[PDB]
Design a protein around this ligand. Structure first.
Ligand SMILES: CC(C)Oc1nc2nn([C@]34CO[C@](C)(C3)C4)cc2cc1C(=O)Nc1cccn([C@@H]2C[C@@H]2F)c1=O
Length: 287
């Protein structure tokens, strides 16, 4: 069901992979560890084209791993692969365009976008949990859950992205991959489990509550997961950290979200809630 592109087609529709940012008149919209994301225009449709940039064989394995997961993983809250380019030296993945970009950039109001309302933040968290539930229900571990990997369409529907590190689902690995500021302690040690996705989602819930990135070079505490200490050690309250760029943050619902995040962020994996419980708790917050 995926359209095979020749590489030259993608070169043509991405202004020959103009690496300049969109604002500078280029085609680059963002980047990750595994490739650079470009805006493309194919058959009157705006698309996202990720050109993959780790040993070369491993890059191909991740390329195909995204294809295999995407082939079986279709959901409202998962980004949709449209096609690929495997011919040529470079590897390309073509996705449905997401007009409102990443949750990370929207939380930071990048490029002048308005602050997200608390009501929309709750819907986004629910949508993201629905996507993770689909992955876990179909026996997949994302392994890179983070706000940069939660994309938003024109209606701000949340869509989980980047299944290159995804795995089927005790099991350990020589390769520790992920985003350290979001990873569970067991994941930092090479353990591979769906419970590590829950911990990373807890950091995301914290980013949503506070509007702060998971790590900020010029910030103390520099890691957001550390603020869970100040709350439990009574050094600070969740009030002190609630994003001030909001006018509709009911205290009860916000404290409800911190509770879900706190449970997700227990260092012991087996004490973490499962995704269905996380779904249930998040639904109960808006009820
Ligand atoms: C987060 C970055 C990397 O992506 C985007 N940023 C955007 N910023 N803006 C706007 C518009 O007006 C603004 C003020 C600037 C917001 C629109 C965007 C669309 C995207 C996009 O469609 N991005 C992906 C779609 C599908 C998949 N993947 C995964 C990487 C794999 F391919 C994507 O990254």
């Amino acid at each position: 069901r995926f359209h095979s592109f020749s590489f030259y087609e993608l070169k043509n529709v991405t202004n020959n992979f103009d690496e300049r940012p969109i604002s500078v008149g280029g085609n680059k919209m963002g980047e990750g560890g595994f490739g650079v994301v470009y805006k493309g225009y194919v058959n009157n449709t705006t698309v996202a084209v990720k050109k993959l940039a780790i040993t070369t064989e491993e890059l191909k394995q991740q390329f195909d791993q995204e294809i295999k997961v995407m082939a079986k993983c279709q959901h409202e809250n998962l980004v949709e692969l449209l096609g690929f380019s495997s011919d040529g030296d470079d590897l390309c993945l073509v996705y449905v365009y997401m007009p409102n970009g990443s949750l990370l950039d929207r939380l930071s109001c990048l490029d002048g976008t308005p602050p997200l309302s608390w009501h929309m933040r709750c819907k986004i968290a629910q949508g993201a949990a629905n996507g993770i539930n689909f992955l876990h229900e179909n026996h997949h571990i994302h392994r890179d859950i983070k706000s940069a990997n939660i994309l938003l369409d024109e209606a701000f529907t949340a869509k989980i992205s980047d299944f290159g590190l995804a795995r089927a689902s005790t099991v350990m690995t020589s390769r520790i991959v992920g985003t350290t500021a979001y990873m569970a302690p067991e994941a930092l040690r090479g353990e591979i489990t769906p419970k590590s996705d829950i911990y990373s989602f807890g950091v995301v819930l914290l980013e949503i509550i506070t509007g702060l990135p998971a790590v900020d070079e010029h910030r103390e505490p520099q890691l957001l997961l550390d603020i869970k200490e100040e709350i439990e050690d009574e050094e600070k309250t969740i009030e002190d950290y609630i994003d001030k760029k909001m006018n509709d943050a009911d205290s009860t619902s916000v404290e409800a979200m911190y509770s879900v995040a706190s449970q997700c962020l227990h260092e012991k994996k087996n004490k973490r809630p499962d995704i269905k419980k996380v779904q249930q708790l998040l639904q109960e917050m808006t009820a």
